Each structure stands twice: as C-alpha cells, then as structure tokens.
Swiss-Prot record, chain A:
Component of the precatalytic spliceosome (spliceosome B complex). Component of the U5 snRNP complex. Component of the U4/U6-U5 tri-snRNP complex. The U4/U6-U5 tri-snRNP complex is a building block of the precatalytic spliceosome (spliceosome B complex). The U4/U6-U5 tri-snRNP complex is composed of the U4, U6 and U5 snRNAs and at least PRPF3, PRPF4, PRPF6, PRPF8, PRPF31, SNRNP200, TXNL4A, SNRNP40, SNRPB, SNRPD1, SNRPD2, SNRPD3, SNRPE, SNRPF, SNRPG, DDX23, CD2BP2, PPIH, SNU13, EFTUD2, SART1 and USP39, plus LSM2, LSM3, LSM4, LSM5, LSM6, LSM7 and LSM8. Directly interacts with CD2BP2. CDD domains: DIM1. Keywords: Cell cycle, Cell division, Deafness, Disulfide bond, Mitosis, mRNA processing, mRNA splicing, Nucleus, Phosphoprotein, Spliceosome. It is linked to Burn-McKeown syndrome: A disease characterized by choanal atresia, sensorineural deafness, cardiac defects, and typical craniofacial dysmorphism consisting of narrow palpebral fissures, coloboma of the lower eyelids, prominent nose with high nasal bridge, short philtrum, cleft lip and/or palate, and large and protruding ears. Intellectual development is normal. Disulfide bonds join 37-78. Changing residue 37 to A: Viable when expressed in S.pombe. Belongs to the DIM1 family. This is Thioredoxin-like protein 4A. Signal peptide: none annotated. The modification Phosphoserine is found at residue 131.
Swiss-Prot record, chain B:
It comes from the Eukaryota. The modification Phosphothreonine is found at residue 31. This is Pre-mRNA-processing factor 6. Widely expressed. The chain holds residues 150 to 199 of 941 of the full protein. Involved in pre-mRNA splicing as component of the U4/U6-U5 tri-snRNP complex, one of the building blocks of the spliceosome. Enhances dihydrotestosterone-induced transactivation activity of AR, as well as dexamethasone-induced transactivation activity of NR3C1, but does not affect estrogen-induced transactivation. It comes from Homo sapiens. It is linked to Retinitis pigmentosa 60: A retinal dystrophy belonging to the group of pigmentary retinopathies. Retinitis pigmentosa is characterized by retinal pigment deposits visible on fundus examination and primary loss of rod photoreceptor cells followed by secondary loss of cone photoreceptors. Patients typically have night vision blindness and loss of midperipheral visual field. As their condition progresses, they lose their far peripheral visual field and eventually central vision as well. It is found in: Nucleus, Nucleoplasm; Nucleus speckle. The gene is PRPF6.
UniProtKB/Swiss-Prot annotation, chain C:
It is found in: Nucleus; Nucleus speckle. Plays a role in pre-mRNA splicing as core component of precatalytic, catalytic and postcatalytic spliceosomal complexes, both of the predominant U2-type spliceosome and the minor U12-type spliceosome. Functions as a scaffold that mediates the ordered assembly of spliceosomal proteins and snRNAs. Required for the assembly of the U4/U6-U5 tri-snRNP complex, a building block of the spliceosome. Functions as a scaffold that positions spliceosomal U2, U5 and U6 snRNAs at splice sites on pre-mRNA substrates, so that splicing can occur. Interacts with both the 5' and the 3' splice site. The lineage of its organism: Eukaryota, Metazoa, Chordata, Craniata, Vertebrata. Widely expressed. The MPN (JAB/Mov34) domain mediates interaction with TSSC4 and SNRNP200. Has structural similarity with deubiquitinating enzymes, but lacks the residues that would bind the catalytic metal ion. This is Pre-mRNA-processing-splicing factor 8. It comes from Homo sapiens (Human). Disulfide bonds: none annotated. Transmembrane segments: none annotated. It comes from the Eukaryota. The gene is PRPF8. The chain holds residues 1364 to 1411 of 2335 of the full protein.
Swiss-Prot record, chain D:
It comes from Homo sapiens. Ubiquitously expressed. SURP motif 2 mediates direct binding to SF3A3. Component of the 17S U2 SnRNP complex of the spliceosome, a large ribonucleoprotein complex that removes introns from transcribed pre-mRNAs. The 17S U2 SnRNP complex (1) directly participates in early spliceosome assembly and (2) mediates recognition of the intron branch site during pre-mRNA splicing by promoting the selection of the pre-mRNA branch-site adenosine, the nucleophile for the first step of splicing. Signal peptide: none annotated. The modification Phosphotyrosine is found at residue 48. It is found in: Nucleus; Nucleus speckle. This is Splicing factor 3A subunit 1. There is a cross-link at residue 16 (Glycyl lysine isopeptide (Lys-Gly) (interchain with G-Cter in SUMO2)). The chain holds residues 409 to 489 of 793 of the full protein. The modification Phosphoserine is found at residues 5, 43. Component of the 17S U2 SnRNP complex, a ribonucleoprotein complex that contains small nuclear RNA (snRNA) U2 and a number of specific proteins. Part of the SF3A subcomplex of the 17S U2 SnRNP complex which is composed of three subunits; SF3A3/SAP61, SF3A2/SAP62 and SF3A1/SAP114. SF3A associates with the splicing factor SF3B and a 12S RNA unit to form the mature 17S U2 small nuclear ribonucleoprotein complex (17S U2 snRNP). SF3A1 functions as a scaffold that interacts directly with both SF3A2 and SF3A3. Identified in the spliceosome 'E' complex, a precursor of the spliceosome 'A' complex.
Length: 141, 50, 48, 81
RNA sequence: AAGGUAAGUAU
RNA sequence: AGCUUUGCGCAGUGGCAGUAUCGUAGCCAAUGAGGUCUAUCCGAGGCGCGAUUAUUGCUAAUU
C-alpha cells in the first residue's frame, strides 16, 4: 500500500498516463488509510512485479489530487482505472459500471487476468474489453 | 535507539532458498489420456452370452 | 409434472426380497443345467 | 616447469595448468549471455517506491490513521487528532 | 432503483 | 606382411527419444562428488544461476 509509487498532483497523473506507450497504466484512486483501499493496494502490491512487463501501477490520493473527482466520478472509497496510450480502457465487469473497479479484490490472479485482458484489448485498439469473470454476484455459497 | 548505524547497515538481504526449478518451473504441458482408456471403457460394456 | 427421481428407484427392502428370490431361482436353474451338462445362456437369466 | 598446451600448443608454467585450461575452453556463449544479462538488469524500471517515499507514505498513513498510531484517537479518516 | 452503456469515425 | 584392441578426430549410412539440451572469469570435488539397497562396503561430478519452441538454425507458404 505504501511500497507503490504515488502521484501528488494532476499533472503527475497526466504525465504517468502519457509516459507509458506499451504498458497499461493502472491507477488506483482513493486513500491509503481506507480499509478497502488497503486491501486493493495489498493486492496490487502482490502483483506489481509480475505485471511489470505490460502494466505499471500508481496510487493517487483523491483528496491530495482532486482534479479527477468530477471527471471520473471518484466518489467511492476505492477505485481502480485502466489507461493505455492516453485512452481510458473501459472493462465490462458485469457490475453495471464499465469505467472502473470500485471495490476491492481478494485474488491476485483475478486482478492479473483483468490487467492482461485490458492490455490485449487495448493493444488490438479497443475501448471496451469483456472481463473474463462476471461480477453481477459475489459467488458466495 | 541504541542500534548503532553500523548495525543498521549490516542488516542482511533476504534471499530465496528455492532453486530455479521451484521458483520458475517450466510450463507443464497437458496431454490427452491414452486411447487404451477408451478401448477398455468400451470393452467393459461387453458381456458374455453364457 | 416432471417425473420425480424417487418413483424410479426400487426401495431397499423390496430389492433385498427380489435379490433373495432371484438368486434362489438362479441356483435352481444352475443345478438344472448341471444335470444337462449345459452352460446357462443369457436368455435363461432374462427375467432375472 | 613448462607443460605444452593441449589446446593451443604453447607452453605455460605448471602453476597455471588448471586455470589456463578452464579459461581456454570458455565458451563465448558465456560472454554473450553475461552481456545480455547486464543489459536486462540495468534497464528495467523500478516497480516499488524508493525508501524515502515509503517512509513519507507511512508517515501520511500514521497521520491519517489514529486508531493505530498516535496518542489520541480520532475517526478512521480524520487527521486533527 | 440497479446488476441491460458496444468502442468508434464522420456530419 | 596381414590381422586386431583402445582412445581421439573426420565423414557416411541407419535407428531412437524432444519433461530436455547446453552455458558456468559461480561454488564445491579422488586431499573424495554423491550414497534407498551390498556400509570396515560403493567411487564422480554435484550444486546454484542463466538460455530455450525442453538445443539452435535456415527454407517455403500465408503477410
């Protein structure tokens, strides 16, 4: 949660999105002190080395950097968004919101699969990718 | 507080004890079951006439 | 109504009675075939 | 104490038989593999934040988490106390 | 009330 | 004068297996590697790391 790089103003976020031309820019919008953000950041930290070939992970504090709250509807405790070549890559998670991951995941392989799907779809030149797993339900039994 | 700066520097790095095979195993191929399994399954259904 | 799985499973007690009767019948048929030095055919053990 | 080299035909002092033989049969494939490895580990961008950045992030977390740190305990997200 | 947005390029 | 043994090359033909082949200015090793069986006996490489379509090239297609 604290081992990941941080972006401290909107210009830094724009540059991080613009800098990467061959990798998915995974940016988590939230607060390091929020428990949901702590879970999501732990998951991202567990996979940060694995996906470094095709993904880069940044963390942004939405109070320190409020320049995207109105734009990206960052009014949730945690939010993960995907950008590839200065384009926001939407993902059809099945949750009704195709723009972001607004909850916290528990499986590293889940997040890695989502990142890989986003990377492949964005490389092919697509603005929306279909998630390998549906999230219309939590699969709790 | 009493940890000297030399002790602070002398902290060792953490090294993995697993070897190359454990850390980075070669991809494990999946292969179909041999045809003898289908042959024996179809032979199981055969029955004597006496 | 779709059929219920229970109606097509023979109960344990009736199945044990049937097993006793069927194996007694098979013993009788086998003894009869021994007297003829003949091997039981699939048609002999058809109702069983 | 000069022994004829079985691989080059020259003469080396006996104090350097084993090292000359080991070096003489050194595959250039080793050189190219080492050069490739040097190129790879000196060009990959660091994934995790530097140490001072980690310390600053932990300080911010402690400031904004008084249910774990500090003396007085404010709410989970508040920083005043 | 939702879990039912194709991603676009043009005008 | 022929014949023939061993090792090393160079080729030719043929067979077999691709869960394996290499690399070691890394380490240890006949001053003993490694030992389930045979232990007052066995005797040679082992380990770590790296490369990879489980060796690597061309050629022909589609592109």
């Amino acid at each position: 949660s604290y081992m990941l790089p941080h972006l401290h103003n909107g210009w830094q976020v724009d540059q991080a999105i613009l800098s990467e031309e061959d990798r998915v820019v995974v940016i988590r919008f939230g607060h390091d002190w929020d428990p949901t953000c702590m879970k999501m950041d732990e998951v991202l930290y567990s996979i940060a080395e694995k996906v470094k070939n095709f993904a880069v992970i940044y963390l942004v504090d939405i109070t320190e950097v409020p320049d995207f709250n109105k734009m990206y509807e960052l009014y949730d405790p945690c939010t993960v968004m995907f950008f590839f070549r200065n384009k926001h890559i939407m993902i059809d998670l099945g949750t009704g919101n195709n723009n972001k991951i607004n909850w916290a995941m528990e499986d590293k392989q889940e997040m890695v699969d989502i990142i890989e799907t986003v990377y492949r779809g964005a490389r092919k030149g697509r603005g929306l990718v279909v998630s390998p797993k549906d999230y219309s339900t939590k699969y709790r039994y | 507080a009493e940890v000297t700066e030399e002790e602070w520097l002398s902290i060792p790095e953490v090294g993995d004890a697993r070897n190359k095979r454990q850390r980075n195993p070669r991809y494990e191929k999946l292969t179909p079951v041999p045809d003898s399994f289908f042959a024996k399954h179809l032979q199981t259904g055969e029955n004597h006439t006496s | 109504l779709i059929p219920n799985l229970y109606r097509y499973i023979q109960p344990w007690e009736s199945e044990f009675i049937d097993s006793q009767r069927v194996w007694a019948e098979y013993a009788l048929k086998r003894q009869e075939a021994i007297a003829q030095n003949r091997r039981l055919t699939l048609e002999d053990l058809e109702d069983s | 104490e000069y022994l004829v080299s079985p691989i080059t035909g020259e003469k080396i002092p006996a104090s350097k038989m084993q090292e000359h033989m080991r070096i003489g049969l050194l595959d250039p494939r080793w050189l190219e593999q080492r050069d490739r490895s040097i190129r790879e580990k000196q060009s990959d961008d660091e994934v995790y934040a530097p140490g001072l950045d980690i310390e600053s992030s932990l300080k911010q977390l402690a400031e904004r988490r008084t249910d774990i740190f500090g003396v007085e305990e404010t709410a989970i997200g508040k920083k005043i106390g």
